[PDB]
Design an enzyme around this catalytic site. Sequence first.
Site, mmCIF file in Angstrom:
data_model
loop_
_atom_site.group_PDB
_atom_site.id
_atom_site.type_symbol
_atom_site.label_atom_id
_atom_site.label_comp_id
_atom_site.label_asym_id
_atom_site.label_seq_id
_atom_site.Cartn_x
_atom_site.Cartn_y
_atom_site.Cartn_z
ATOM 1 C CG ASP A 163 -0.019 6.775 11.137
ATOM 2 O OD1 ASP A 163 -1.320 7.054 11.449
ATOM 3 O OD2 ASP A 163 1.074 7.358 11.596
ATOM 4 C CG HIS B 52 0.108 7.524 15.597
ATOM 5 N ND1 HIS B 52 0.317 8.106 14.304
ATOM 6 C CD2 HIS B 52 -0.325 8.355 16.468
ATOM 7 C CE1 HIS B 52 -0.558 9.261 14.264
ATOM 8 N NE2 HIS B 52 -0.960 9.347 15.479
ATOM 9 C CB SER C 208 -0.416 12.803 15.891
ATOM 10 O OG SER C 208 -1.561 12.332 15.486
HETATM 11 C C1 LIG Z 1 -5.019 12.450 14.337
HETATM 12 O O1 LIG Z 1 -6.058 13.484 13.917
HETATM 13 C C2 LIG Z 1 -5.874 13.943 12.751
HETATM 14 C C3 LIG Z 1 -4.734 15.212 12.528
HETATM 15 C C4 LIG Z 1 -4.581 15.690 11.433
HETATM 16 C C5 LIG Z 1 -5.150 15.232 10.242
HETATM 17 N N1 LIG Z 1 -5.290 15.889 9.033
HETATM 18 C C6 LIG Z 1 -6.047 15.196 8.118
HETATM 19 C C7 LIG Z 1 -6.737 14.383 9.163
HETATM 20 C C8 LIG Z 1 -7.972 13.280 8.677
HETATM 21 C C9 LIG Z 1 -7.455 12.070 8.062
HETATM 22 N N2 LIG Z 1 -6.597 11.503 9.017
HETATM 23 C C10 LIG Z 1 -7.233 10.836 10.391
HETATM 24 C C11 LIG Z 1 -6.133 10.054 11.146
HETATM 25 O O2 LIG Z 1 -8.451 10.768 10.376
HETATM 26 C C12 LIG Z 1 -6.046 14.331 10.426
HETATM 27 C C13 LIG Z 1 -6.464 13.703 11.634
#
Ligand SMILES: COc1ccc2[nH]cc(CCNC(C)=O)c2c1
Length: 345
Positions: free
Chosen positions: A245, A291, A145
């Site tokens: 996901d 996930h 993640s």
């Molecule tokens: C889980 O939190 C994260 C971890 C790495 C990430 N890279 C980019 C994003 C923003 C877009 N994806 C989300 C789930 O908002 C991000 C969020």
Amino acid sequence: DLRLHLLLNTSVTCNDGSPAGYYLKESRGSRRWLLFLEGGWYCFNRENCDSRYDTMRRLMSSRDWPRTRTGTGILSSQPEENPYWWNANMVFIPYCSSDVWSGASSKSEKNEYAFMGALIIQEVVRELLGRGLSGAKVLLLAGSSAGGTGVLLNVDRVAEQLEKLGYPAIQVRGLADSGWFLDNKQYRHTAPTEAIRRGIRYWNGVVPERCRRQFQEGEEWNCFFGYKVYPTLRSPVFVVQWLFDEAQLTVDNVHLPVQEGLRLYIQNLGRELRHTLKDVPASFAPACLSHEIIIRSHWTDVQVKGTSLPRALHCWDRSLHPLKGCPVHLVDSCPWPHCNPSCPT
Ligand SMILES: COc1ccc2[nH]cc(CCNC(C)=O)c2c1
Ligand SMILES: COc1ccc2[nH]cc(CCNC(C)=O)c2c1
Ligand SMILES: *[C@@H]1O[C@H](CO)[C@@H](O)[C@H](O)[C@H]1NC(C)=O
């Protein structure tokens, strides 16, 4: 059980100034080293980091860490649980910087919190070279993640650090699990791209050099999206991503009698994810709503086209020495969650 070591350089800190660290289990008969980056979302301003400190403090501080941790999944030392790398040296790096492993900022009179994720990784690697890493043949930087995005942001920096320190024989590779996201149109409105933009300024976040030079000043948020940063990387990286996901669907404002508009939305999301992986030669992407996977104890159970993830990773190892019966690119083509019977329940 992996044992906790706090960093000897105590200027490399978690959010609240406590020392960062790593959990280690050595395997003296092995030249392979696995360094795993924990996940756990992020925070991007004073008020939202204050709330994280109230109810997610272990992700901001080492004051309350336990002395040991049990290794599970790819971090297990039992071949029955980990067919891939059970005999490796195992490292778990706790996530206590709330910055998607990108920060390079100390606590100060102008900063209530320290955001040092990128520096934590480099200091762990350094301190490990004196505990056996200097003899390694392969260093696999893995993560789930937020830790999966952290692999993409940091694997080339680790490779550069070891070359300039005088260890060119160590092959640095990456394994990014559940960190490959799309900056897509959302199903409803209530945005992650703007939270990341503000976060990078708050953290003094850093991104890989070639990606930074493509997108340039002000646009470094682009390098947090896997399909944009991956083509710029020089180290080999294996990408694991569920096609549906749960974190992606949450930020898209989808919560699961599905009517036509939402059916088309979900099917288009799987198609777009598939498309972004078509030029990624080492990848594993099942058509499931889930996930994370690689540190789950039953990670051996899911298969794509008849091949398990531990097998796919073994075939990747062989390819880094087109193998008959040993594939490395495994992406589902069926268009709805759980159309693959091996999906988790
Ligand atoms: C889980 O939190 C994260 C971890 C790495 C990430 N890279 C980019 C994003 C923003 C877009 N994806 C989300 C789930 O908002 C991000 C969020
Ligand atoms: C594709 O259409 C658009 C149009 C305007 C937009 N502004 C911001 C985004 C990205 C929104 N997705 C996430 C997960 O952050 C966007 C998309
Ligand atoms: C401790 O880490 C900081 C931050 O990276 C660095 O500036 C400093 O040189 C390190 N200390 C030593 C003794 O190397």
